[PDB]
């Protein structure tokens, strides 16, 4: 496969300000209405967050802009998206983005996400292709439009889908979805959340608590990555690609000391950075 459409586009990365955001639970220990303080990797408040767009229509007619770059992992990574209609599935996290290293391949193929830690060959323009089988009338997902080779694989896992819809809501939710990715001490841990948002694009003032999903033996350093996509085929109209619109949020983590206020039920609301001002 490795079908590719770079479609490079100009303009500066549109930034934003994470007000109160990216506060997860950095322990399993249940605490109630106490102020706990740790210095750990987080996304510090009032931070510069890049509102990127994987597919971006700027209207004249059509003009879908596929920009999503390979991005360094740096210290840690934060992620956020709305995507009432999912176009986002997983991420390619790795180092060489090639063989010679392992590869973190998260595919939330409906409905069983098959997390994969393997050695792949990722193409120049990787993303998940989706088509129509005509047998059983089902939309399959061609997974090798992402990567050519799959072999040597070190690890495999399956779970209930992290990406989840609700819909029926004609908006007013947008189903804002956040995922935090932190790679330490042999455990690369995943965090999640689902939130309604009525605002047009950017984030509210509310706090988002992210529980750890799975704590997995990863043992690889991931210095760079890119997201994944779900596109399809169309048929004769004046091939089809770039289903809907796609945009998401990315910011990098950083060691900071937060004071954590648990609730009577252990639901952290107020967190405060010490070094902020």
């Amino acid at each position: 496969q490795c079908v590719n459409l770079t479609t490079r586009t100009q303009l500066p990365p549109a930034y934003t300000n994470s007000f109160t955001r990216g506060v997860y639970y950095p322990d399993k220990v249940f605490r109630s209405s106490v102020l706990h303080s740790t210095q750990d990797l987080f996304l510090p408040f009032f931070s510069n967050v890049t509102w990127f767009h994987a597919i971006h229509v700027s209207g004249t007619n059509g003009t879908k802009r596929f920009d999503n770059p390979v991005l360094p992992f740096n210290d840690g990574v934060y992620f956020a998206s709305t995507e009432k209609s999912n176009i986002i599935r997983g991420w390619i996290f790795g180092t060489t983005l090639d063989s010679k290293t392992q590869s973190l391949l998260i595919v939330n193929n409906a409905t069983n996400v098959v997390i994969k830690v393997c050695e792949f060959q990722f193409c120049n323009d990787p993303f998940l292709g989706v088509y129509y089988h005509k047998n059983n009338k089902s939309w399959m997902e061609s997974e090798f439009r992402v990567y050519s080779s799959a072999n040597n694989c070190t690890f495999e896992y399956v779970s209930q889908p992290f990406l989840m819809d609700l819909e029926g809501k004609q908006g007013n939710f947008k189903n804002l979805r956040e995922f935090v990715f932190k790679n330490i001490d042999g455990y690369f841990k995943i965090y999640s959340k689902h939130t309604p948002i009525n605002l047009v694009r950017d984030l509210p003032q509310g706090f988002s608590a992210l529980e750890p999903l799975v704590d997995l033996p990863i043992g690889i350093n991931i210095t760079r990555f890119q997201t994944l996509l779900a596109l399809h085929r169309s048929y004769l109209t004046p091939s089809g690609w770039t289903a809907g619109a796609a945009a998401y949020y990315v910011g990098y983590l950083q060691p900071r000391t937060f004071l954590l206020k648990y609730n009577e039920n252990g639901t952290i609301t107020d967190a405060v950075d010490c070094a902020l001002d």
Partner: antibody
Amino acid sequence: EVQLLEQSGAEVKKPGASVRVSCKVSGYTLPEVAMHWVRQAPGKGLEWMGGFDPEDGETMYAQKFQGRVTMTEDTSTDTAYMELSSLRSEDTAVYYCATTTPFSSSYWFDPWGQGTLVTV
Amino acid sequence: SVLTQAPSVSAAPGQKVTISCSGSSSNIGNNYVSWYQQLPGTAPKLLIYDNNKRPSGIPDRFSGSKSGTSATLGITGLQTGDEADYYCGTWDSSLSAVVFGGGTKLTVL
């Protein structure tokens, strides 16, 4: 969008034979789109043949010619074999590989097939 | 085959004249119509689908209409390279299949 592979090649089979027709594709995958067939006799018109049905999900067979010609599909190698049997007088002709869309009625076919004559 | 159109038609270049195909309610009545072009020993090319939709690469000078069981293929701005046969087709539920007419070979005078 898409260009296709040929329908057959040049297949010349003397009377007392039968011939498969294997039409491959490019730029698509085989079972995202439905194939079709049309008899075209030189100096004559179109006679539709074979074909897949968007409704009911079956692969159609032209009633007039039903039972004489069959079709199979290999999804990965994109090979769709059209086997016509029991050669007769007027049945040597160009038989076009054509492809409408299973999603809708799409009576409109693929832009064009290049054509292959047969032999009786 | 089961449809109605003439073997050939002729007209002077650069003029405006169309070609029609007469079906029935069992074929054209409830179904969408297509039109095709082939040069001698060549690949028959889709002309118009649904009688209102041009495929990619078709001159806008072509139009179409469906009046009852009658479907006309709009042909305008005749060219020296426009001489060829045009074929009408529409879905058939009678034999539950695809049908065509005998074809009409245009001639640009």
